[PDB]
Design a protein around this ligand. Sequence first.
Ligand SMILES: Cc1ncc(C[n+]2csc(CCOP(=O)(O)OP(=O)(O)O)c2C)c(N)n1
Ligand SMILES: Cc1ncc(C[n+]2csc(CCOP(=O)(O)OP(=O)(O)O)c2C)c(N)n1
Ligand SMILES: Cc1ncc(C[n+]2csc(CCOP(=O)(O)OP(=O)(O)O)c2C)c(N)n1
Ligand SMILES: O=C(O)[C@H](O)c1ccccc1
Ligand SMILES: O=C(O)[C@H](O)c1ccccc1
Ligand SMILES: O=C(O)[C@H](O)c1ccccc1
Ligand SMILES: [Mg+2]
Ligand SMILES: [Mg+2]
Ligand SMILES: [Mg+2]
Ligand SMILES: [Mg+2]
Ligand SMILES: [Mg+2]
Lengths: 524, 524, 524
Amino acid sequence: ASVHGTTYELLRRQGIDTVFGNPGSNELPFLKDFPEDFRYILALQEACVVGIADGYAQASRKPAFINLHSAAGTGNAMGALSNAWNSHSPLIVTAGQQTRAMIGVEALLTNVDAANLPRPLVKWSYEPASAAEVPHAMSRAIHMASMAPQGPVYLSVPYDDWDKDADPQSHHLFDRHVSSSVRLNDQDLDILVKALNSASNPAIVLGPDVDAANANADCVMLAERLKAPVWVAPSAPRCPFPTRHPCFRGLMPAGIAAISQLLEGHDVVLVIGAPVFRYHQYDPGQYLKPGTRLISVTCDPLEAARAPMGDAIVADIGAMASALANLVEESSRQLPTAAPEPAKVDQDAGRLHPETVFDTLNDMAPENAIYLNESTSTTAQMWQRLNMRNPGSYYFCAAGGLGFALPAAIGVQLAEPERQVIAVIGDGSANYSISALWTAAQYNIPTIFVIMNNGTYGALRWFAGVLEAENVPGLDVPGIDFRALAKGYGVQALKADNLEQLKGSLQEALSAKGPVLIEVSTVS
Amino acid sequence: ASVHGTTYELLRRQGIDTVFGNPGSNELPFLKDFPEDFRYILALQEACVVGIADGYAQASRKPAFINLHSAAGTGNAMGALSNAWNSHSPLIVTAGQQTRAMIGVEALLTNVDAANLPRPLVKWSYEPASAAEVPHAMSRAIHMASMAPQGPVYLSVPYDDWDKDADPQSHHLFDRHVSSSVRLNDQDLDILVKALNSASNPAIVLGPDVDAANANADCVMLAERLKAPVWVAPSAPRCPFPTRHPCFRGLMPAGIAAISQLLEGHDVVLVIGAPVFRYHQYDPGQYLKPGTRLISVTCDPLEAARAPMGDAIVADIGAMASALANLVEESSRQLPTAAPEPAKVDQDAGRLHPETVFDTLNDMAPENAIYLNESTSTTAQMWQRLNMRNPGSYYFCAAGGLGFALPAAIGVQLAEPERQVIAVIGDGSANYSISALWTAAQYNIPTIFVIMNNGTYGALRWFAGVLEAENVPGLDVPGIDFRALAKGYGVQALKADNLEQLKGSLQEALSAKGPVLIEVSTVS
Amino acid sequence: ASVHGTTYELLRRQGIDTVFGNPGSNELPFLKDFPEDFRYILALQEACVVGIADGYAQASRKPAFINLHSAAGTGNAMGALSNAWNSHSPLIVTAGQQTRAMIGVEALLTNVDAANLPRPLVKWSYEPASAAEVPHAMSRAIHMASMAPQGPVYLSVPYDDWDKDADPQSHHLFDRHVSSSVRLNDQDLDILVKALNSASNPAIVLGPDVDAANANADCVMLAERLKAPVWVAPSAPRCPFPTRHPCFRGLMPAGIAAISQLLEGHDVVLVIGAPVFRYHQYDPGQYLKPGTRLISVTCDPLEAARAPMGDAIVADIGAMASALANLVEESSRQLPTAAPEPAKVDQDAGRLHPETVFDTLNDMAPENAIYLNESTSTTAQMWQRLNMRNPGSYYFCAAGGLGFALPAAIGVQLAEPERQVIAVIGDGSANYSISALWTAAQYNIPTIFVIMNNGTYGALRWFAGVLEAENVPGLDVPGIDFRALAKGYGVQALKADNLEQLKGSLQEALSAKGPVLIEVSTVS
Ligand SMILES: Cc1ncc(C[n+]2csc(CCOP(=O)(O)OP(=O)(O)O)c2C)c(N)n1
Ligand SMILES: Cc1ncc(C[n+]2csc(CCOP(=O)(O)OP(=O)(O)O)c2C)c(N)n1
Ligand SMILES: Cc1ncc(C[n+]2csc(CCOP(=O)(O)OP(=O)(O)O)c2C)c(N)n1
Ligand SMILES: O=C(O)[C@H](O)c1ccccc1
Ligand SMILES: O=C(O)[C@H](O)c1ccccc1
Ligand SMILES: O=C(O)[C@H](O)c1ccccc1
Ligand SMILES: [Mg+2]
Ligand SMILES: [Mg+2]
Ligand SMILES: [Mg+2]
Ligand SMILES: [Mg+2]
Ligand SMILES: [Mg+2]
């Protein structure tokens, strides 16, 4: 058997059937004779390739396979990997290396010191010492990406390895099943449960890993039993709780002071599947107000280590959420009252306010719609005006790296063909991975792209204010015709300069059979 | 003064007055109060930012300053840096870090293990241990990028450093002048000169570093004195010799066997400013045929070390070229006869043959035009059909990383306002850094983009044929409207489906006052 | 031929004939059938192996070859490499890797992520992608270590590579000659020479690289022509000037303020072959007093970049020293007056004062003796009381890493069999690489070890006093019998509790035919 054959067998046996990539000569020996049980998804640029795969992996809750071209290709995807790292996305990144016979002279396309290139943005980076080792190395890649805490991995393979003979003993790799579905031991778990049962005024903070583990339901239960309010950890990469459940209290602002203020009065704060805490703006203060004790359940040792306060338990979020939900007692306290609906902002017949757009989307989008957010200055209003009842309904660049939403929305839509994906992207953000649109058109992936156009890097103008910065260059991005760009890549385009047009566009997009981009004129 | 003030003073004192970047919050403290003697060039995506700066640096022959946003921003430019590394481009890459007070918890936007991120694609990567150290660190960055062998450097700075007080002793950094303009010692230089004077049938091979050092003229002289043929080293990132000079013998094919064959019969082969040798395709054979001795003059120790044959001298290409040109004796041998003009290929009234395009470009483009090449399957014909008489007239992604030409052409044009830049880019390559177009429009940089559209990854289909590799997915890129894309970013667009239209388009583009993109229908 | 045969051929052809190492199974395939024209020097511990090789390389002024055992072996030598890096020691460090067939499972002895292990203490670190590449990789190692700035390199080789067939084209590696013997271009050199000729009160500061390039003589000339005082850069790893020459002004204290004070009044300060400046203690002040201009000639770009002041020229120290010495005019100024002999300290009939020891050594040691210093609290008196007239007469751990002197002295003695090597080592320092003594005994290398025994980490106690730091543990090292330790490794031992015994011991050691260790009772 060839390394080629054995590797594809390993891949299918491990459940992989899709390859996201952008071809190069170093990868031809791998891509040739592409198995009929596999499908290839092409993207015009590596940032888009990984972005799409990322969305696919996050939504499908299974690892995604990627194939890039040597250093340059890997390099173009580094930004995307920074996000994947923060979202614990199980991505298997493979890149073609020059033929071993020419790595020495460093012939064009030689990935020099390869394994070090994607570092420190991957859980594991490696290049086999021989062709027969490739299948084994691939096995390691697959599991390193899948084990908690999930994350991106990198494997570099010289192109002349594929045709070489594979080690017969490689078949032992095919059905290996590795599990990390673990939870705190019984004795210690009871101690925790008792603490929760004793809490006089508990509070729960949920992170992206909850949604990744599809522990949403269990968390809803846990929250109802403890009759506690639920917040989403700051800089939320995903939505781990139904935003209209009586317990939900929204997205926590990414500030130290802001959060300790919010948690004040709560004797026990239980954080699940989130870093403690992904702060953003500099909002100095107390990590926790006196009287508040924090307990963190994370799937990542690195998260537990850097938490500046509280205790931590490193385990599987799904296993823990389930266990806790079924052990805590039903508190006799009154279930929290649902937060009131947000106020309806004034809206004339001109350019739209973000609030108006979200309110409209909320009214017209299907209940199981999936949103992606890369409209950097409107995140707060968005989290308040969109009723997301189900899991996997929200995605935001986990590392703040723009250029994620657009390609990722295509991946998500590819993973969830039965759920309408709607990506709300700022006019500035839309440019980073604009070429991703082509993939949606080509494979007819019905993603809807709502471009919020205010002609400026809104969020930055905001920070400029708080940072009290003046004469800052490059904050405006005028002169971009998104309908023209959509046309450039074969995607139906619509324009919405006012509320009536927005409604009309949305209605048309919703019923359209292919991808659709709507350029919305928003207020600065 | 502040770290902010002192740094800008250091920058201007070191000749820097332009900042290429894409803003983020971590960089606001640095960009605020932007000095009036500086200019900011905004690009919609980091790959474009570095690409533009790269072209600017290569053409201006002076370092270029870049400002990116934390990890994600740096990550998006990794592909671009792979090229910069191969072309010895003096790029000073600076990226904003989170405020020191929040690096510990790893707040959103914290560049974790920062210095390791751009490795191994930079000569130096660093993050200061204190705010007062920033100016010094900046000084190191500037010089590390400028000293031979020039290359990209990385400096990460926590955003709260800028407002801090600078060390008064920093003024000692302002006017530091570091030189690496060195050449082989007298005794040894004479030994070399005598060897060249004794060569019965010498041959000269020139690399990108010759053009970078503007040693072109001196090399022409050297070639005429020795009455020797001149070749351009394989995978040429730049053109180091007038392509129509009687001695010129063209671009060497990137094959081991092909090159040793070419050099057979030449007793002494002098290679200047090039790696020995940037092979590409696997063309096994002898590094050198018996009877051929090789001598390499490189500015990079890494190049001299990995050369699989011949002797080497590590020194400044400019200094050496000059010295050699003035010391070698005038050989009595007959000056080589100029190569004959390439044949005119058959061309009907339909889609154009690449040859036709280049022949036309050669006839219509100004004599001091500057070309950029990212039409991967037509490089050979291009090098044969374009008469490039002057230095800095050709640029090709040094590492083979696509997405360079388009943004780089804008940088070159910005550096050479008096020379018409014409970038010939394949329809596939054009997508990688498509958003760069916006910058050309915004700053009205009159670059001309000629998109060779054959709807496929030509170079890849070719190779597929050698590998007789069949069933290779993702080799075609149909459905892209480049005129629409150009419109999307505000750039005048034209279409050329045949020779007459090509001529008309070129003529219009040439006289146009702003950037122009021409979509040319080429044969598959 | 085999990789084994071809590599040894490359080694001998490149002038290497000695292998310093400590064997392991991964290295057996390389060491078997050890060529008769090579010699192996065994050391009991890796820190000693590299230490010995380091001394050998520095004295012989040629690269030294080392062979260590996988990660653990490389690991034990990391401290030694830190010194080698600071002294620009051309060391070729090779370590045996597990067989390629077992690197995947990480069998015992697998050097994981090998190339990263010695980083950042090596100029180049690498592991070949195939057996046939080994000879080429070795070639790169040899040259990367030898080119300016010289330094240690690392090459990891799977043990199953040696028996594999070597690429026939490898013979092209055998006689490659790479040169970096370069100097500033003519035009710019004259500008420099004129500046020196115009200096009204020039000063010269010499570094270790001067002695490494054996540019001592030329510097003496240069100093006499300019009639300028000469200082040795702080933390001197070597002695670059005859310490009793009328111009010599001694070792500069490693303090910023101290040095700018020393240089005050000198309009032009020329620094050659030294970092600007290897400060040690925190002595804040001005880098240079107003009126002083500094010019640095360094062989290391990293040195030129971090210099906080002055101009710099990166070139070969030998070439530059020679050129300058023969171009500067003979100043009409009065040649500096030789510094007076140091005062003779009071010495009773008890424990000895360091001063007494040095005075005695100076009187009894041959004029071409070679000293090594690792008596951390007596460096100043030593530099004042030892008349070192010739080059390669002094060595001090370049990075301050103790455990260098003892093994290095053996290497130096092995390189200079005709010069008596005398290593003055503190009782604390002697322990770090104590086992090195065995090698001296085994190969009968007549090194003389003078242990300064005051039963305490003297230098640290000093610093403690500045910090007025009190209650610092682990500063005393009582209970060590060095004569017993010497006996343990088969080295003749002597004791000196007073001046008469010292004289007697030295006299006996000097005439002894093998290594000799003298334990000297010094005052605390
Ligand atoms: C790759 C990358 N480059 C730069 C940034 C910094 N940045 C953060 S928000 C922002 C503005 C983008 O705004 P847009 O999406 O147009 O909408 P708005 O800010 O008005 O919400 C920028 C440039 C980033 N996060 N990622
Ligand atoms: C960033 C990056 N991704 C992928 C590749 C691999 N690659 C090399 S040539 C090529 C084809 C691009 O072709 P195009 O420019 O459309 O024209 P051609 O000359 O090939 O017909 C590709 C995809 C690369 N070099 N760089
Ligand atoms: C490997 C290593 N460990 C620790 C130190 C720190 N250190 C510096 S000087 C010193 C004292 C050694 O003293 P000794 O050689 O006995 O003599 P004296 O200090 O009295 O001169 C120590 C422990 C070091 N430089 N290197
Ligand atoms: O795929 C390849 O071979 C490689 O990326 C390449 C091919 C042709 C031109 C530039 C770069
Ligand atoms: O610039 C920033 O602050 C940062 O990149 C950011 C801001 C807002 C949303 C996402 C990311
Ligand atoms: O040389 C080896 O094989 C290896 O270092 C080894 C061998 C036996 C015991 C421990 C370690
Ligand atoms: Mg990296
Ligand atoms: Mg905007
Ligand atoms: Mg094409
Ligand atoms: Mg290390
Ligand atoms: Mg002591």
